[PDB]
Design a protein around this ligand. Structure first.
Ligand SMILES: [Mg+2]
Ligand SMILES: [Mg+2]
Ligand SMILES: [Mg+2]
Ligand SMILES: [Mg+2]
Ligand SMILES: [Mg+2]
Ligand SMILES: [Mg+2]
Ligand SMILES: [Mg+2]
Ligand SMILES: [Mg+2]
Ligand SMILES: [Mg+2]
Ligand SMILES: [Mg+2]
Ligand SMILES: [Mg+2]
Ligand SMILES: [Mg+2]
Ligand SMILES: [Mg+2]
Ligand SMILES: [Mg+2]
Ligand SMILES: [Mg+2]
Ligand SMILES: [Mg+2]
Ligand SMILES: [Mg+2]
Ligand SMILES: [Mg+2]
Ligand SMILES: [Mg+2]
Ligand SMILES: [Mg+2]
Ligand SMILES: [Mg+2]
Ligand SMILES: [Mg+2]
Ligand SMILES: [Mg+2]
Ligand SMILES: [Mg+2]
Ligand SMILES: [Mg+2]
Ligand SMILES: [Mg+2]
Ligand SMILES: [Mg+2]
Ligand SMILES: [Mg+2]
Ligand SMILES: [Mg+2]
Ligand SMILES: [Mg+2]
Ligand SMILES: [Mg+2]
Ligand SMILES: [Mg+2]
Ligand SMILES: [Mg+2]
Ligand SMILES: [Mg+2]
Ligand SMILES: [Mg+2]
Lengths: 152, 70, 117
RNA sequence: UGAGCCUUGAUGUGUAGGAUAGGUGGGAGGCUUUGAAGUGUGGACGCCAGUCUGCAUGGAGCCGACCUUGAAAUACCACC
RNA sequence: GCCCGGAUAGCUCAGGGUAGAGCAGGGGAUUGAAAAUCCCCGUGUCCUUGGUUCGAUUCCGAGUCCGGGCACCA
RNA sequence: CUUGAGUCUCGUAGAGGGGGGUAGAAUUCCAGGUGUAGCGGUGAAAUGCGUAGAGAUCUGGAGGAAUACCGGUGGCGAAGGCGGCCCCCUGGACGAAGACUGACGCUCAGGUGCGAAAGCGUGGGGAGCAAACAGGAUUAGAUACCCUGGUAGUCCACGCCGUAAACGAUGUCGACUUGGAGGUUGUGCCGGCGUGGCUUCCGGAGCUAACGCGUUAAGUCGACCGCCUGGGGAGUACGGCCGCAAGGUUAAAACUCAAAUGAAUUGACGGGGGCCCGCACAAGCGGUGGAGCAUGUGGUUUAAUUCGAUGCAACGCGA
């Protein structure tokens, strides 16, 4: 706001992995305050992904994550009526948040039977550069690339 | 604004020397003044305005010390 | 087709566009590149990045003659003056002189009228 | 400076594939110390993969069918 | 009638082991607008037919249309 | 008679004026070499120029207009105005000491002369700019602002015109009346100390409606001249004079209103300037506008569809 008084809110770990990153993933996926359903879906999808990939629950998830993180975005700035699209670096926390948001959004728009299966398919595709999340990441990167002349 | 690079300096030193020479030569000022026509009346008016503002600021700063703020 | 081993870079920077040419010591041109012909049009053509890209393209388009020693002459008030020289050095030439050769009337003719924007 | 007539040099790497091999061949023996496998060296082209190269050190080998190609290997060799 | 050239993306059209560049149109980035810039989307016997070739849009032959020069024009 | 006015001797500074010559930078055009696909312009575009070779860069040539830096709330002139360098003709100002004339002075109606820019006449010149004009845009329209071109004109000689916010919105001449900080230009004595001319800012008494002026007076006085008499009509009509014309100068009346006006004070407002705040934007999450139903309102209908709230701050409101 105009003040900048807030600190930072403490995030509790997930029950059976002890990672706050997966807890934030659950938080992003949760709707209507129904956290148990989100945890069931996340755990089932992670189990299926690890089984079809073979590595583990955690580092497979991280590998699928690092193929969606962006490193530059564009913000609009009007000067003389028209708007330039200035590219700007993305802080790491925003990187993770945008990555998770794009993965969940991509998995939401699919035609499978269960949400767990949808997330598993989208996340496996992300782990090897075929999901729509990777397409969105590349689109953002190239749009920022076009407006390099305005990077002050 | 003629800059010849001497022996064994980095580029940035030569570039800065060229920039200082250009700034002290008053090049961009001359090329920007001579872009549009200025009536003589406008020239005299702006010269007088600059002189008046300079004198007013000088008097203000001259008398500024004696007054104390807290 | 020929080797010169040294040449003069002429930079023509204005408020709308920047042009870069390479010539021999006698004035004959060897190649050229421009900021408007590098994919930038409109408000993007008058920026230092476009000048840098144009300098890169001009340097790439003159590889045949094998120039290694370079001289720079800059005229005009445009944004693309320092960027072009920096990119030219990054291309690998060694710069011997830098000069501002912008014209100055010593009175001259009568400039156009002021714009009432 | 444009065109023609000659003569020569190379140039022309679908796909297999040692092979920058165009249809067509008298035909698997010439080349080699009438300084040779491979070296240093300089040069032109090159889809830069692979030719070619003035000379020398160097010293005398490559070498033809032979199996992937439809074809056979400037092994001596004609024509375009 | 004889000859000289061409027919390919919706349009303009480039190019013996191939179909291509741009613009037209759909949506999303995008905002109060067109810019602007992003991304994708097809748009194919290269007129048709036959003939050579280990396959032909890149070779030949003929028929449909169009342009140019000429002929016939009693 | 010499104290006001003027003459003579020596020097100083200065874009004061008229005439001629000449230099360098830059723009445009012509010719040629290199070289290749864009240039130019805008908020964004387009008209426009370019493969018939532009734009960029190099060399040679022609022509016209104006003089970067110095340059300064610096200088000169009655005002208008005056800016590269050199020569010829020429006006004024100031200073230092001295000799001379002896009131020869101040002001001035009519009158005479000078007078920015645009404009008019005859003849030359024409690079750049640019009324009128044409095209491209913007817009509800756009006879505009913006872009691309462009003719009179701007330049020279001679002659008219006679007006400007021609302003210090402040007529000319003389005298007297506390201070401070500078600029520029002379001269005397030993960097210091004096003494003249012009000039910028601040301020005292006094003046003034206030704002402000304040030894360069809008203070205290004297001489002469010009002008004013509520706002429109109107600096207009008619007459005279002047002009080639455009028009200039002199200068009313009917009718109409009860005001028009100057300076300063408190607010409010600004597509004026600073410094802050609020789920006001930004970052997010979920909705409404589409469907069916509940409810309130408007309108329409009815015998009645009782009355009231009806921008935010009325519409599941009184109920
Ligand atoms: Mg807040
Ligand atoms: Mg202009
Ligand atoms: Mg003088
Ligand atoms: Mg003079
Ligand atoms: Mg030319
Ligand atoms: Mg004076
Ligand atoms: Mg004189
Ligand atoms: Mg006497
Ligand atoms: Mg008179
Ligand atoms: Mg005039
Ligand atoms: Mg005239
Ligand atoms: Mg005239
Ligand atoms: Mg004339
Ligand atoms: Mg117009
Ligand atoms: Mg013009
Ligand atoms: Mg005229
Ligand atoms: Mg008057
Ligand atoms: Mg007056
Ligand atoms: Mg007066
Ligand atoms: Mg007086
Ligand atoms: Mg005062
Ligand atoms: Mg008074
Ligand atoms: Mg009256
Ligand atoms: Mg009159
Ligand atoms: Mg009259
Ligand atoms: Mg006339
Ligand atoms: Mg009033
Ligand atoms: Mg008032
Ligand atoms: Mg205010
Ligand atoms: Mg305000
Ligand atoms: Mg928001
Ligand atoms: Mg609804
Ligand atoms: Mg009611
Ligand atoms: Mg009421
Ligand atoms: Mg309520």
């Amino acid at each position: 706001p105009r003040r900048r008084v807030i600190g930072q809110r403490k995030i509790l770990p997930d029950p059976k992995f002890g990672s706050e990153l997966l807890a934030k993933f659950v938080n992003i996926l949760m709707v209507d305050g129904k956290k148990s359903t989100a945890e069931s879906i996340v755990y089932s999808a992670l189990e299926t992904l690890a089984q079809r990939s073979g590595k583990s629950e955690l580092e497979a998830f991280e590998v699928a994550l690092e193929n969606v993180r962006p490193t530059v975005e564009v913000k609009s700035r009007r000067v003389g009526g028209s708007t330039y699209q200035v590219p700007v670096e993305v802080r790491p926390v925003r990187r993770n948040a945008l990555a998770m948001r794009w993965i969940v959004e991509a998995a939401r728009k699919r035609g499978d039977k269960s949400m767990a299966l949808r997330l598993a398919n989208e996340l496996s595709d992300a782990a090897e550069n075929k999901g729509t999340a990777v397409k969105k990441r590349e689109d953002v990167h190239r749009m920022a690339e076009a407006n390099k002349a305005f990077a002050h | 604004p003629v800059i010849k690079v001497r022996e064994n300096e980095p580029f940035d030193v030569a570039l800065r020397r060229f920039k200082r020479s250009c700034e002290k030569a008053g090049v961009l000022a001359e090329v920007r003044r001579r872009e549009f026509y200025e009536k003589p009346t406008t020239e005299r008016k702006r010269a007088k305005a600059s002189a008046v503002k300079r004198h007013a600021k000088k008097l203000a700063r001259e008398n500024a010390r004696r007054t104390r703020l807290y | 087709r020929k080797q010169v081993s040294d040449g003069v870079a002429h930079i023509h920077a204005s408020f709308n566009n920047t042009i870069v040419t390479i010539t021999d010591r006698q004035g004959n041109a060897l190649g050229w590149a421009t900021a408007g012909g590098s994919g930038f049009r409109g408000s993007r053509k008058s920026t230092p990045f476009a000048a840098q890209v144009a300098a890169e393209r001009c340097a790439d388009a003159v590889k045949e003659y094998g120039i290694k020693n370079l001289e720079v002459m800059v005229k005009g008030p445009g944004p693309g003056r320092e960027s072009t020289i920096r990119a030219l050095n990054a291309a690998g030439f060694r710069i011997t002189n830098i000069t501002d050769v912008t014209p100055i009337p010593h009175x001259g003719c009568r400039p156009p009228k002021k714009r009432r924007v």
